[PDB]
């Protein structure tokens, strides 16, 4: 019971009360002291937890650890003892993001008279000292600075009352360090390359610039609520403590540090003239506001309805254009370089839940942001655009596809390849897949018809062709007859024995015919593949066969991208074709004309994931089997791991070799015909290569020797190398 009640109450304070917060902190303060005799360990646990899991409540709980320290010095000393232990653990386990919340909780305690202001400074001095450390990844040297700077919004003001001498010498080594960092990763992490309006800044530079405006403002920010900073009635006479000498954990080969980031920015106060002035991009208020909002989503991501509510009720010290901050932060997450913190579909419905909660004001802002995103499309990164298309099209389908399409009339007279028209075409294509062809033709104006998607009709070769000069024609006609008759494999094989030339012609007449007679539904085509599965495994026993199947299937369904995708997927899972073949198919000349369409990549990534999932699965089995006949298996599971990983490496190897080949071909041709290198085709192609790295950087890391010395070498065009070097900078 009691155990239960404590955790309940510890949370109540953070939650929205119905009696001034200060009161609750007053009460809970004593209550907790009264229970210290019997429940010291639990309360000591509960607080260390809310400290690393409820950052958005940082100051409500620091206060609490204060009122307590103001009634039991020895208690505070124990809490601060745990915190350091808890912090050393998070660090050793590579859970750096959790650490920051700890390191930041300590910081604010200094404002609660619990930790010696001078004490904090000594630790930070050691954090920055990491910048000197020799032969360590920059992402490591980066995290300590970030942990330091991100704290100042809380500690800085009072941490400036003391040790300004070293609290100047620290900024000194920082400034020095900040100007010596390589920024190779920025181009690969920016949502937009255009900085004409608002620049997408490297996260440390942006924060550095933020501290400055604060420092030069005498460290006086006006947002961070402070519920335990008032030590003029109690906290004053409290006896602070001293954090033991903190020696940052030595960089090991098992260390993994957060990747660098780029600050997503799309709004400024002029985007909301008639609304409370929006904190500027370089104001700490902006940082803190987005930080809490990001943390709120991190705490409630699993429950969308609770989530919207915690966002909308966010407590701001001084009024701010909340709705705008909520939308900006959600897009900041959806478009997070390659992909955000949580599953993509979560942001879609989260936004819906917010529109249902603030019916009168959220929708307009969301409609304003959509407009702005569309207008800035020209320099948005391909990976984000895809995300934009899927979000918007899925969003539309929940609001009867109602949108003011004429607002985007400008796309109508642009090269079909330009980002705007292409974006519209893709969005519409997506809307069709969530409903049907005719429905979409009906929602857009007559002027847009040209951008609507083609009717997804099957294309039989030997069909009502009547153009019979084609090879295997009659053979196909027998097949059609057999299939409609509940023919068997051997029978079909027989029909096929009468085919003149791995036999390309046999494949084509089989596929063209089998698919045509199952073109009514996905479920028909599937069973079709399952029934005559044996035939497939025969005709396509070779890679040429595998490749030819994909080629004929594409010939048949080129007007129905969703069909093509589900078929390839089904074929891979039933081993009618393998990922290598799918990869070669993607870069094949037969797809050259559709190379930049979304479905092509949606398929390639879905193939890569199946490969990855597969590898992971077998690895686990071995893992479990190794944790125990039982041997003959581990012998076998080992072999399977080998093959799986080998085929995985080969998939990345081929994909990269193909990218290098087509990009070089383009670069050379251009550098010969003195033509522009920056074509729409190039943009998609170079950014698609970048995406391979973004989506699977973890797996790709395992191939550094091969990648760094065998593929992406110096003889390669710098435009291609650039992509590789950007990737390496992610964990450099």
């Amino acid at each position: 019971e009691t155990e239960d009640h404590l955790e309940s109450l510890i949370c109540k304070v953070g939650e929205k009360s119905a009696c001034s917060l200060e009161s609750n902190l007053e009460g809970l303060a004593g209550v907790l002291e009264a229970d210290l005799p019997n429940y010291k360990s639990k309360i000591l646990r509960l607080l260390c937890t809310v400290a690393r899991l409820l950052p958005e409540k940082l100051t409500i709980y620091t206060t609490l650890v204060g009122l307590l320290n103001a009634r039991n010095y020895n208690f505070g000393g124990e809490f601060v003892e745990a915190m350091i232990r808890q912090l050393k653990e998070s660090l050793k386990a590579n859970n750096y993001n959790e650490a920051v919340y700890l390191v930041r909780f300590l910081s604010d305690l200094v404002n609660c008279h619990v930790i010696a202001a001078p004490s904090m400074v000594a630790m930070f001095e050691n954090f920055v000292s990491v910048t000197q450390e020799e032969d360590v990844p920059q992402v490591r040297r980066d995290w300590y600075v970030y942990a330091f700077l991100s704290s100042l919004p809380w500690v800085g003001k009072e941490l400036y009352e003391k040790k300004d001498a070293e609290m100047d010498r620290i900024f000194a080594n920082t400034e020095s360090y900040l100007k010596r960092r390589q920024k190779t990763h920025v181009p690969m992490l920016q949502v937009w390359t255009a900085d004409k309006p608002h620049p997408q800044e490297e996260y440390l530079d942006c924060l550095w610039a933020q501290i400055q405006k604060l420092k030069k403002d005498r460290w006086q920010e006006r947002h961070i609520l402070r519920p335990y900073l008032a030590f003029d009635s109690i906290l004053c006479e409290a006896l602070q403590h001293n954090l033991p000498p903190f020696t940052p954990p030595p960089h090991t080969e098992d260390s993994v540090y957060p990747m660098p980031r780029v600050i997503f920015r799309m709004f400024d106060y002029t985007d909301d003239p008639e609304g409370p002035v929006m904190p500027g991009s370089h104001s700490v208020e902006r940082f803190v506001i987005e930080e809490n909002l990001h943390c709120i989503i991190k705490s409630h991501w699993k429950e969308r309805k609770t989530c919207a509510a915690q966002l909308v009720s966010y407590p701001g010290k001084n009024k701010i254009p909340l709705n705008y901050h909520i939308v900006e932060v959600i897009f900041a997450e959806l478009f997070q370089l390659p992909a955000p913190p949580h599953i993509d579909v979560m942001y879609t419905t989260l936004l819906i839940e917010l529109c249902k909660l603030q019916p009168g004001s959220l929708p307009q802002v969301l409609a304003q942001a959509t407009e702005m995103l569309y207008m800035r499309l020209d320099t948005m990164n391909t990976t984000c655009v895809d995300r934009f298309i899927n979000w918007f099209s899925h969003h539309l389908s929940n609001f009867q596809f109602r949108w003011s399409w004429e607002d985007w009339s400008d796309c109508l007279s642009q090269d079909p390849e330009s980002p705007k028209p292409k974006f519209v075409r893709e969005v519409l294509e997506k809307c069709m897949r969530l409903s049907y062809h005719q429905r979409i033709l009906d929602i857009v104006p007559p002027t847009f018809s040209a951008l609507c998607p083609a009717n997804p009709t099957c294309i039989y070769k030997y069909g009502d062709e009547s153009s019979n000069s084609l090879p295997g024609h009659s053979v196909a006609l027998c097949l059609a007859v057999a299939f409609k008759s509940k023919a068997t494999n051997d029978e079909i094989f027989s029909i096929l024995k009468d085919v003149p030339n791995f036999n390309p012609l046999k494949i084509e007449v089989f596929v063209q015919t089998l698919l045509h007679l199952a073109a009514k539904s996905f479920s028909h085509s599937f069973s079709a593949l399952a029934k005559f599965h044996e035939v497939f495994k025969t005709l396509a026993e070779s890679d040429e066969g595998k490749l030819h199947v994909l080629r004929v299937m594409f010939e048949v369904w080129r007007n129905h991208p969703q069909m093509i995708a589900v078929l390839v997927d089904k074929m891979i899972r039933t081993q009618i074709v393998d990922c290598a073949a799918v990869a070669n198919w993607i870069f094949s000349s037969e797809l050259s004309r559709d190379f930049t369409r979304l479905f092509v990549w949606e398929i390639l990534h879905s193939t890569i994931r199946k490969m990855n999932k597969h590898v992971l699965k077998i690895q686990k089995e071995l893992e479990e089997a190794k944790e125990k006949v039982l041997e003959e298996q581990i012998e076998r599971l080992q072999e399977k791991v080998e093959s799986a990983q080998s085929e995985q490496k080969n998939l990345f190897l081929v994909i990269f070799q193909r990218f290098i080949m087509i990009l070089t071909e383009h670069l050379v041709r251009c550098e010969t015909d003195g033509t522009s290198v920056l074509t729409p085709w190039y943009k998609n192609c170079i950014e698609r290569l970048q995406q391979i790295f973004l989506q699977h950087h973890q797996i790709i890391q395992q191939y550094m020797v091969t990648l760094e010395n065998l593929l992406f070498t110096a003889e390669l065009d710098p435009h291609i190398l650039a992509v590789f070097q950007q990737f390496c900078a992610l964990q450099a």
Binding site: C19, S20, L21, E22, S23, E26, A29, L67, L225, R226, P227, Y228, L229, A230, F231, D232, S233, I234, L235, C236, K317
Partner: protein, 137 residues
Amino acid sequence: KKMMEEAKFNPRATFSEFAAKHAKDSRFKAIEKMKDREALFNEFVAAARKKEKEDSKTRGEKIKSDFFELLSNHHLDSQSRWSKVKDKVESDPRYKAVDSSSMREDLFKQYIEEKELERQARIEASLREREREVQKA
């Protein structure tokens, strides 16, 4: 309490903000413990917010009540048009006392809504008996 009367209301003021505004005031220092300063701060807000509510919604009932009293002076029925009445009452302090035009019109619309009634009740009872007899048949 005096410390809070020197600032600008701020009913949703944080305790550390309130403590910053009144920290050098002697009525603030007069209370020994920080906890009791916060408790007085919390209660006075909660009693001021409780009173603003109860006050601004007896003024609401008083604005509305006055507006009706103004209208009661003119011979209004379901016919009468607000386009016409407006130009007759627009000078009154009870008309201006409603800070909006959309709402003076709604209040007006609300305000706007024996033998013949006996015959109507006759028709109603006849229809009821007819429905009952039709159901029985």
